[model samples]
Target: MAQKVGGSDGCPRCGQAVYAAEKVIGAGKSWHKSCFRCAKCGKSLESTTLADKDGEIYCKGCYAKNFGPKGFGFGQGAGALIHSQ
Candidate 1:
């Protein structure tokens, strides 16, 4: 069954207003289920909600590209400092 799109505005990808008959994922930033596509590669992605920020929508790949690789832990802590007695 198709889901209903909700929100005050339309999908950033298709620019179509939220409709009760349309399939959507997010609420406030609702987007059509098929409207979501990778901005960098233009590939269809799974139904995922993205926080609307800076007036742009980014796909998972694009998001990671901008945020960098995950689990990139920090290096060792500060080295020890010694002073002669």
Candidate 2:
């Protein structure tokens, strides 16, 4: 049997009461998936998993901006060294 995870009565960002999927993300805050956006930049995230709970969900550009070193290192140096040129 699927357990029901109760939804939020209001949006965390807009504070509007509506029926939405309750996404439990960082710090135990329950929000509608549509309500919660990237704290550093405004980008919509669809879902959350245990591994993604406390992590940042950023759109492509914002993600690159915040984690440039890690991202570039992986896509450029590492890719060229191992995966591709």
Clashes of each: 0, 0
Model 1 spans with C-alpha error above 4 angstroms: 1-9, 21-29, 49-52, 61-85
Question: Candidate 2 lDDT, tens digit per residue, 4-79?
Answer: 4464444455665555545444554445656556655655554542223454444434545564554434455433
lDDT of each: 0.53, 0.49
Per-residue CA lDDT of candidate 1, range 1-85, in tens? 2343333446655766655535554334555767765555556666653333454455765565556754544754444544552
Models 1 onward score TM values of: 0.38, 0.39
Task: List candidate 2 segments past 4 Å from native.
Answer: 1-8, 19-23, 49-85
Quality of model 2 by C-alpha lDDT? 0.49
Question: How does model 1 score by TM-score?
Answer: 0.38
